[PDB]
Amino acid sequence: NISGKFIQIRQIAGLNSSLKSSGTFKLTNDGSLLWQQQSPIKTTMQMSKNKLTQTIMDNPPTVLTRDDQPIVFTFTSVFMSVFKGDTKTISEFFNINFDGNTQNWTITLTPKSSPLNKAIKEIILKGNRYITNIDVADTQDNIIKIELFDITTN
Questions:
Q1: How far is 59 from 6, CA to CA, in rounded Å?
Q2: Which residues take part in binding Mg(2+) (predicted)?
Q3: Which of 148, 153, 144 is nearest to 131 (CA)?
Q4: Is residue 138 marked as binding?
Q5: In the chain, what are the domains?
Q6: Terminal C-alpha separation, the chain
């Protein structure tokens, strides 16, 4: 069971500023991800096996489907896979380039096939003992940059 903090910066090509958010995450080896945005507005994303639910503030949660938010499902899959050493699943959907060692590594992912290669240009992961950075670039010049820190395993 793994938990940490994140800072997210979303750069959308047409907006005149970047959107910054932050919070915490919790992974179990049971297959669950809790992604809790704490700033600037509270939101919760919870992934269990094949189910993703979203809660905005105190509103009722809603169930997200793969057809509606594909990058969200893809990011969750890659994120969980990296923490468990699951390059097999990543490879089913992505070309993988591993650069470096344990003191420092960078993994470049590019999607293998359509339709994922129409939506994602590349995903870059960097880390040492744990992932430190994830960057998701779409095919429309938008980028999401995530920094992970204060990771603990108890």
A1: 23
A2: 67-68
A3: 148
A4: no
A5: 2-153 (2.50.20.10)
A6: 6
